[PDB]
Amino acid sequence: ELTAMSAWVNQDGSTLYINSINAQGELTGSYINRAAGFACQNSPYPVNGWVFGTAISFSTKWLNSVESCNSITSWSGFYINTGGQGKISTLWQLVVNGSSSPSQILKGQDVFSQTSA
Amino acid sequence: LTAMSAWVNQDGSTLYINSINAQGELTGSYINRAAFACQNSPYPVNGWVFGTAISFSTKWLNSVESCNSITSWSGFYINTGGQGKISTLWQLVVNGSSSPSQILKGQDVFSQT
């Protein structure tokens, strides 16, 4: 149920909108960040990545036509079905332009639930 | 970091960056030579470059071999001691995983070639 045209919302209210997943599993989409305390909110950021069965990676560069956060986030995760409901559970890494040490790469965890209007 | 640049890590694996478009979206191929399966054949790569920051990811499935997983690298370009390097942290997620503890993590440093 990791499919093209599926949307996923995390604990901050941020949403991954998956647009396409091609025959090879290559992913395109958009992400809208709504996490308090972060910048680059409320506008769409292009996403690319891969799907392999239930495994998924997706990444976004925080630059678009309205706002830059000078960095890139990459999520690695997996789809799970629980209670008859799909979720994607992820770990992310955030690398900032101009970094000089691996210690500067930020890590965190996001869990996403399936969503639609 | 430029299009048509190649980078070899401490284990002998190579990232071949093919394109970096006007938005910094990256296209390329990866050949694994780390004494991990899926060795010696090309795997497509996608990702992003933002200044000296870079992410790239590969799905371990091609026409010759599957490793049922995806690796994603996050890293940054540095030029020290006269050679360009990309210093990265990677995460590897296996198809069928059910806990974040199953995602494997490591560090790779890639040198220009």
CATH number of B1-113: 2.40.128.30
Alpha-carbon gap, residue A60 to B25, rounded angstroms: 10
Residue with tokens 């026409």: B63
Other CB atoms closer than 10 Å to residue A95's CB: what's the count? Answer: 27
Q: How many CA atoms lie within 13 A of A41 on its CB side?
A: 9
Name the CATH superfamily for A1-117. Avidin-like (2.40.128.30)
Q: Is A42 helix (H, G, I), strand (E, B) or coil?
A: coil
Cβ distance of B76 and A95 shorter than 8 Å: yes
Contact B55, B38 (CB under 8 A): no
Way the structure was solved: X-ray
Resolution (A): 1.4
Q: Which two tokens stand for residue B56?
A: 């790239």
Phi and psi (nearest 5°) for B39? -95, 150
Inter-chain residue contact A72 with B48, CB threshold 8 Å: yes
- The answer to whether A54 contacts B95, with C-beta atoms less than 8 Å apart, is yes
Structure token digits, residue A105:
């790469």
End-to-end distance of chain B based on CA atoms, in angstroms?
12
**Domain limits, chain B:** 1-113
Across the interface, which of A46, A63, A80 has its CB nearest the CB of B50?
Answer: A63
CA pair distance A41, A32, nearest whole angstrom = 7
- Cα A64 to chain centroid distance, Å, stands at 15
